[PDB]
Each structure stands twice: as C-alpha cells, then as structure tokens.
Amino acid sequence: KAIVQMAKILRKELSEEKEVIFTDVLKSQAKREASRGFFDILSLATEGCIGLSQTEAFGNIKIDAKPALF
Amino acid sequence: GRLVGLELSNFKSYRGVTKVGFGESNFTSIIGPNGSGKSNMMDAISFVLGVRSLKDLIYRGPQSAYVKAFYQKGNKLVELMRIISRNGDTSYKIDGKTVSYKDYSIFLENENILIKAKNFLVFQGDVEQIAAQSPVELSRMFEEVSGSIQYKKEYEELKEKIKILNQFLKIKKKRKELFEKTFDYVSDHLDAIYRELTGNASLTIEDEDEPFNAGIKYHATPPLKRFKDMEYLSGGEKTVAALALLFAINSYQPSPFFVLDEVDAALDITNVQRIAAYIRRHRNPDLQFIVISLKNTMFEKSDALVGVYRQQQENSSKIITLDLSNY
Ligand SMILES: Nc1ncnc2c1ncn2[C@@H]1O[C@H](COP(=O)(O)OP(=O)(O)OP(O)(O)=S)[C@@H](O)[C@H]1O
Ligand SMILES: [Mg+2]
C-alpha cells in the first residue's frame, strides 16, 4: 500500500510547513511514479486527509494538511 | 478537430463552476478513486454532444446546469454549450448564439461525431457488449453507423404495398450501397486491428442480398486458441475482441475522439498493456483518446492526467491536472 508511504512523507513535511507542492513531494522519493503519486493525493484528498488546490491548467498543485492526516 | 476542454456548472457532482483542460494531450486518462466522479465527467461530455442512451443531472446539495465543450475546428476554437433547466427544457448554443438541435446535430455530424451511433463513447460496463451483442443488433449498428437506417422507414412502407416497385428498388439500392460503403471498409480493416491488439477476426453478412435485414456474425479467435463463437471467449478475451470491433467500425468515418470508461476492467496486466500500447501508438492530433481507468498500467502511459477527487465538506467533485509528457 503506497497510499500510506505517501501519507507518511506528507504527514511529516506538513508538520514542518503549511504548504507543500506536489512536484516537491515527488522529489523526495529518488513517470510511472508521477502518476502513481498523483493518484495517491487524489485518494488522500477524497478520504479527507489532505487539501488540494491548483491555480492554472497544468500549474502547481498546493497540498495542505487537514486534522485527519494525523 | 480536438476536445480542448470542458466547463461544467452544477453538472452532477460538480457543484459550482468547474474547468477541465486537456491541454495538447492526445491521450488523457481521467483517474481518481471510486465514487469521485469520473463517469459523471463522461456523462458531461456525452451531454454537451446531444446523445440519449434529465433534471437528474443538475447538481444536488441550483435550478439549471450547463456544460460547455471547447472544440478545435481548424484555426477557430468553437464553444459548444447545452443547458438544462429544472423543468427539463434543454437549449443549445454555438459560440454563444442559441441554435436548434438540428443545426447542432449537423455541426457535430459533420465533424464525424455521430451522436446517433454513439460508436465513439463506451460507457462504464458496456465494452464487452460491443462484441457480445447479437448479429441482428450488430447489423442494426452498422445500419446506424453507415446511415443506411434512414431509408429504413420508406423501405418498409414501399415493402408492404406490394411501377411502385421502381421506388422500392431505387431506395433498396441506397440503403444497401450506403450500408456496404461502411461495412466493407470496416471488414477490410478489422483483422489488422484485432491482430495488433494481440490473432484473427472477421465479419460475416447473413442475408447477402439484403444484409440490413439480418445478422452480421462477428468472429474473433484469440491467438494461441481456436474457436470463433463469442460464446466461448472469456471476459478479457471478449473485451479485446470488442475493442477491436469498436476501433474497426470507427475507422471508416473517424470520430475525432474516443471517451472510454473502464474498458480495461476485465483485462490481464498483459492485455492492459496492449490496449495502452495501441492507444499510444495511434493517438495523434486527429485522434484523441480520453480514458477513465483505475489501473496504473493504463494511465501511466498517458500524455496527461485529469485527476478527480471529492471534497466532502463542499460535497462536490474537483479537478486537478498533471502533464506526464515531462516525466
Ligand atoms: N446530481 C448529483 N448531485 C450530486 N452528486 C451526485 C449527483 N449524481 C451523482 N453524484 C455523486 O457522484 C458519484 C458517482 O460519481 P461517478 O462519476 O460514477 O464516480 P466514478 O469515479 O465513476 O466511480 P467508479 O465508476 O466507481 S470508478 C456518486 O457517489 C454521487 O454521490
Ligand atoms: Mg463510474
């Protein structure tokens, strides 16, 4: 289950900062991986553990934490 | 042409205003968890295009909902819009100016989007049927895709009456030639496509003189095996046979894009790979593939991704996009 490995890296980083960019979270793990992580966020946002926001078409995805992430 | 993007307004689970940009992707996968609202997104595409496979659309905690599609017709970017009021009254618009469903249907019918045949939209859970349908049904579809179905009424009227016979031969010659104009092409390209998705497949007319008055027997034989009746094929086998027919039939008057829901649900990891390979290998500015898959094997190979997620507080689906052509 990778939705936990991703929840972990985010649960950490979101305790040392308010905002986190998707590209960065991927960064700290080293294309099949980008998509894999992308789904993980979407999953997490749906469960309610995370917040998502994007400004432009294919711009940056801002990830913020929610009380449930913990 | 290409489907550049969409704009939904209280469409289904898409409360408020939602913008979806496909960018220059010619292979986009709409991914997200169960219940997030991916199929609703396809329901929106089929909705703007006409298609009747109503107030039950419109979001539910507004009085009307609308969907806009930004089609790329040459240099210009056309805006196709459709609205539904809570009473059921729909309205169509093109580039902002209201129009009739006839003018609308034609615009699309001219860009090869036959909302009649729906042969470019495979809804969730329906892929295997394209193969498993009955010969009579397959025939009906051919009649529907070629256009030969039009002469169906008149042909029946004049058929019953029995110099009134020349009016019957004249029309028979059209229903038949129009039907063959499509069938022949499809038949000729069917086997190559099936083999690529692998193999051997074929179509067979039953009533040779009047093919439209009988079944069309579809035969597919997965590789290392040897049978022909769809009855013997397994779920994954039936799926692949279906995707081949689906693509063969569209090869005649190529729709500009496909919207496939969970077509890969019954597939091997090997087979998911072949479909993904095929899609990637054939996608291009003229043939765009919008796929909804839960499988990484599938969406990994995409050009871009449209991620759908829920936002429980706000009780609405949401969208975020990612371009995979970089990774
Ligand atoms: N009129 C509506 N108003 C608000 N929410 C709606 C409406 N119609 C449907 N929904 C919601 O949308 C969900 C269905 O979304 P779909 O588009 O089927 O999701 P999905 O991502 O396709 O899921 P699968 O097929 O299981 S992978 C349901 O769970 C509903 O709660
Ligand atoms: Mg669905």
From Swiss-Prot, chain A:
It is found in: Nucleus; Chromosome; Chromosome, Centromere. Coiled coil: none annotated. Cleaved by ESP1 at the onset of anaphase. Phosphorylated by CDC5/Polo-like kinase at the onset of anaphase. Phosphorylation takes places at proximity to cleavage sites and is required for an efficient cleavage by ESP1. The C-terminal part associates with the head of SMC1, while the N-terminal part binds to the head of SMC3. Belongs to the rad21 family. Present with 1040 molecules/cell in log phase SD medium. Interacts directly with IRR1/SCC3 in cohesin complex. Cohesin complexes are composed of the SMC1 and SMC3 heterodimer attached via their hinge domain, MCD1/SCC1 which link them, and IRR1, which interacts with MCD1. The cohesin complex also interacts with SCC2, which is required for its association with chromosomes. Cleavable component of the cohesin complex involved in chromosome cohesion during cell cycle. The cohesin complex is required for the cohesion of sister chromatids after DNA replication. The cohesin complex apparently forms a large proteinaceous ring within which sister chromatids can be trapped. At metaphase-anaphase transition, this protein is cleaved by ESP1 and dissociates from chromatin, allowing sister chromatids to segregate. This is Sister chromatid cohesion protein 1. The lineage of its organism: Eukaryota, Fungi, Dikarya, Ascomycota, Saccharomycotina. The gene is MCD1.
UniProtKB/Swiss-Prot annotation, chain B:
A motif (Nuclear localization signal) lies at residues 172-176. Involved in chromosome cohesion during cell cycle and in DNA repair. Central component of cohesin complex. The cohesin complex is required for the cohesion of sister chromatids after DNA replication. The cohesin complex apparently forms a large proteinaceous ring within which sister chromatids can be trapped. At anaphase, the complex is cleaved and dissociates from chromatin, allowing sister chromatids to segregate. It is found in: Nucleus; Chromosome. It comes from Saccharomyces cerevisiae (strain ATCC 204508 / S288c) (Baker's yeast). Pfam families: SMC_hinge, SMC_N. The flexible SMC hinge domain, which separates the large intramolecular coiled coil regions, allows the heterotypic interaction with the corresponding domain of SMC3, forming a V-shaped heterodimer. The two heads of the heterodimer are then connected by different ends of the cleavable MCD1 protein, forming a ring structure. ATP binds at residues 32-39. It comes from the Eukaryota. Belongs to the SMC family. SMC1 subfamily. Signal peptide: none annotated. Cohesin complexes are composed of the SMC1 and SMC3 heterodimer attached via their SMC hinge domain, MCD1/SCC1 which link them, and IRR1/SCC3, which interacts with MCD1. The cohesin complex also interacts with SCC2, which is required for its association with chromosomes. This is Structural maintenance of chromosomes protein 1. Present with 5710 molecules/cell in log phase SD medium. Changing residue 146 to L: In temperature-sensitive mutant SMC1-2.
